Design a protein that fits this description.
This is part of a larger assembly, with chains A, B, C, D and E. By secondary structure, chain C is mainly alpha-helical. Chain C contains 5 helices and no strands. The longest helix of chain C is centred in the middle third of the chain and has 39 residues. Chain C is rod-shaped. Classes of the chains: A little secondary structure, B alpha/beta, C mainly alpha, D alpha/beta, E alpha+beta. The complex binds magnesium ion (MG) (19 copies). The site of one magnesium ion has 2 residues of chain B, from loops. Chain C binds 2 RNA strands through helix 1, helix 2 and helix 3. It is classed as ribosome.
RNA sequence: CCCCGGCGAGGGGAGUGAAAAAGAACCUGAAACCGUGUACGUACAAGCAGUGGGAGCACGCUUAGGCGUGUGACUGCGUAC
RNA sequence: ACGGGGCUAAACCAUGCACCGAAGCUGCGGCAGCGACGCUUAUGCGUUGUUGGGUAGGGGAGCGUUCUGUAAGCCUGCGAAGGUGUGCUGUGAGGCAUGCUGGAGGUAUCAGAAGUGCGAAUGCUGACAUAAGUAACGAUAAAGCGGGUGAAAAGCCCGCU
């Protein structure tokens, strides 16, 4: 099975109307280090909910 | 065209347009359909039509006052400076000079002058008589031209 | 004397593509499709220069019919009355009067009714 | 000088009431189709809806001649295979009396976006009462 | 004062990078950098390096301040494609296009 | 030479030059094709996608000129080569 | 098994008068062919009649492209060719002017010669689309974690399973 006519650039754009990425709504701010992080994820320096959970 | 007579691909089955030679004129690098050959473009002119045209050209020149007749035309030494000075005296810049006997000094003196050329009485041609603004003929040349043109 | 076709071929391809401005899709981009679209557009234009004269007359007649029935007479009897009254106003003007000057149109109906009666 | 053309912004539309009691279905529908389209106005243009708003009362009292009260059949297909439904005239009256007049007029209107816009100006009621008194609709003794 | 940074011949197709580009079109550079940090895309890493390089150009060459910069223009153009041959079944060959892209970021305070 | 970058790639400055939108993927740089921006249209609407009519909007005017340009709601006709 | 709505006439028959209706006919403007009559031609202009759908095909007349002469001329760094817009113009092929780009050639006129005009040939070559960010990532012997290195480690190094 294969196309009988070349689909247009218009049809191609309509199909991709749902391919748009959804940016992260908002980052959480740690209460101790004040860093930004994904909610429910530890920070880049190992903080989570105001606690140094990993020492690296 | 340099190449092989091998059929590029079989006649049927491949799904491509049928081909028989890589030298086909349809193909890139193929031959020319009606490739030229060294040919001869010279036409025939009847003797009377050639002479009849010279008379019509010469008679037209005297009607345009583009034909100047002098008793003699020569220079002492083969130096283009002398000939260039002589033509300036006659108010001539673009001129065809026709003499009875081809003098070497007059021939050498005119070789470097662009708009000037000398010619024997027997060496005239139809396009030269038309190409130049003025045509200067000696009294001997016009006499020889009449015998040439009957 | 080899002649390269590049300059004149591009010129005439642009001439076609310029007349195809505003057409959808390949009809304004690629020459093969645009050329057919331009030829078809010329055919329609030739045909519609004749159709335009029919459609407008058809529109005038409809407006005259409406305005005449506002005065108590049909388009048929109104046109026949004007010819019997030797009035030679055409339908483009009658439809124009019927819209912008009601009282003059009513005067024409009176003239038409008189020629019939 | 170009022929006048009506503009959708500046066209005025009046409201009318029609009592369908005893009227012949078809000969009433043609008069409605004329006024819904605007064929009765001198400013009529084909591509503009210059028609009027029309209210039809007593749609269930519309009349038909001959044996059409029991023999005129209304067909429609539901889109499912074998889904050809039919209903005679008098059961259309008993079930959806407004549909009879709406169907008849819909067939006499132009087909397309403008034709569907003209059809919106038709308000059909089975009974004798309507709640468009705010529009002050004028009696159209047709 | 517009400031431009480009990544030409970026090893990624323009269609994939454009998904990330429209996430930050019009945003402030501080907010755009956070969006790119938490976008799980390879193109997010490419766009982030171009964005922060445009920020550096704006402050070092134009003396602008980071607090006022905004991503006023961003677009991804197609770069040259590298042709590769991939053998398929039954001796047939397919030509693989390794597409590239040109990433352009324009930051500005106005 | 300076800056971003992985002592990258790539880029921004600076400098050279008549020109760097001549920067080595280098004269000119068309078309298909792919984008960004702006104007207008478009989510009750059926078909060779135009054509005739035509509102509205945007914009250039002139300037009360009532013209031009872009778009094209709605509508007649219309089954490519 | 009226094109539909609908119709008891909006059906049928007879008669009559209106109207609608084509690129037919008429009106107004324009073009061309063929006659005729002449002016009187210098061989064109002027009346007048008439004609002007068209495949195969026959006849007639042109446009434009490259090259040769005309041309050691003319145009051109005060911007050529080419590219890209715009306006004007001819019945058409077209032409002219001009903004921007371009950065060095172009060429009147009248003649001459053709590798002289492309949308088709499952044409040839190159470029780029589409399907589509889809199928697939090549044996179902299998991985897990700690440490290291590094801009970055599921895949590299070391270790233990
Ligand atoms: Mg060979
Ligand atoms: Mg060859
Ligand atoms: Mg001989
Ligand atoms: Mg007619
Ligand atoms: Mg570098
Ligand atoms: Mg270049
Ligand atoms: Mg809508
Ligand atoms: Mg139609
Ligand atoms: Mg006729
Ligand atoms: Mg003919
Ligand atoms: Mg130019
Ligand atoms: Mg071609
Ligand atoms: Mg053909
Ligand atoms: Mg392909
Ligand atoms: Mg699929
Ligand atoms: Mg799937
Ligand atoms: Mg899969
Ligand atoms: Mg494997
Ligand atoms: Mg590990």
């Amino acid at each position: 099975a294969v196309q009988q006519n070349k689909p247009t650039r218009s049809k191609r754009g309509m199909r991709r109307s749902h391919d748009a990425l959804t940016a992260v709504t908002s980052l959480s701010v740690d209460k101790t280090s004040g860093e930004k992080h994904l909610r429910h994820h530890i920070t880049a320096d190992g903080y989570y909910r105001g606690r140094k959970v990993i020492a690296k | 065209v340099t190449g092989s007579g091998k059929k590029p691909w079989r006649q049927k089955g491949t799904g491509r347009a049928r081909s028989g030679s890589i030298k086909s004129p349809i193909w890139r690098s193929g031959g020319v359909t009606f490739a030229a050959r060294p040919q001869d473009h010279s036409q025939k002119v009847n003797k009377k039509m050639y002479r009849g045209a010279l008379k019509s050209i010469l008679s037209e020149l005297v009607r345009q006052d583009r034909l100047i007749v002098v008793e003699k035309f020569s220079v002492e030494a083969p130096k283009t400076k002398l000939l260039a000075q002589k033509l300036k005296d006659m108010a001539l810049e673009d001129v065809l000079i026709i003499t009875g006997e081809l003098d070497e000094n007059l021939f050498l003196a005119a070789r470097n002058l662009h708009k000037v050329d000398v010619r024997d009485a027997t060496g005239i041609d139809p396009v030269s008589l038309i190409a130049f603004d003025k045509v200067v003929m000696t009294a001997d040349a016009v006499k020889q031209v009449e015998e040439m043109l009957a | 004397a080899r002649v390269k076709r590049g300059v004149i071929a591009r010129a005439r391809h642009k001439k076609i593509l310029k007349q195809a401005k505003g057409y959808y899709g390949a009809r304004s981009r690629v020459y093969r499709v645009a050329f057919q679209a331009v030829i078809k557009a010329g055919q329609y234009a030739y045909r519609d220069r004749r159709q335009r004269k029919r459609q407008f007359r058809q529109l005038w007649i409809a407006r005259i019919n409406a305005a005449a029935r506002q005065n108590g007479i049909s388009y048929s009897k109104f046109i026949n009355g004007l010819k019997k009254a030797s009035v030679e106003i055409d339908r483009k003007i009658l439809a124009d009067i019927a819209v912008f000057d009601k009282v003059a149109f009513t005067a024409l109906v009176e003239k038409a009714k008189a020629a019939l009666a | 000088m170009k022929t006048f053309t009506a503009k959708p912004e500046t066209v005025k539309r009046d409201w009318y009431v029609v009592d369908a009691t005893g009227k012949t279905l078809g000969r009433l529908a043609t008069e409605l189709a004329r006024r819904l389209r605007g064929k009765h106005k001198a400013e009529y243009t084909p591509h503009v809806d210059t028609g009027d708003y029309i209210i039809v009362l007593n749609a269930d009292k519309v009349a038909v001649t001959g044996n059409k009260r029991t023999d005129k059949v209304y067909y429609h297909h539901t889109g499912h295979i074998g889904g050809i439904k039919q209903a005679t005239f008098e059961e259309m009256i008993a079930r959806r009396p407004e549909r009879v007049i709406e169907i008849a007029v819909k067939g006499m209107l132009p087909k397309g976006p403008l034709g569907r816009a003209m059809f919106r100006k038709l308000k059909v009621y089975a009974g004798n009462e309507h709640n468009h008194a705010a529009q002050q609709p004028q009696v159209l003794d047709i | 004062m517009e400031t431009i940074a480009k990544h030409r011949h970026a090893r990624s197709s323009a269609q994939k990078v454009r998904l990330v580009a429209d996430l930050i079109r019009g945003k402030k550079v501080s907010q755009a950098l956070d969006i790119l940090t938490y976008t799980n895309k390879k193109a997010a890493v490419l766009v982030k390096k171009v964005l922060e390089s445009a920020i550096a150009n704006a402050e070092h060459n134009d003396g602008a301040d980071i607090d006022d910069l905004k991503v006023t223009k961003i677009f991804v153009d197609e770069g040259p494609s590298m042709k590769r041959i991939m053998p398929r079944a039954k001796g047939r060959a397919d030509r693989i296009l390794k597409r590239t892209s040109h990433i352009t970021v324009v930051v500005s305070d106005r």
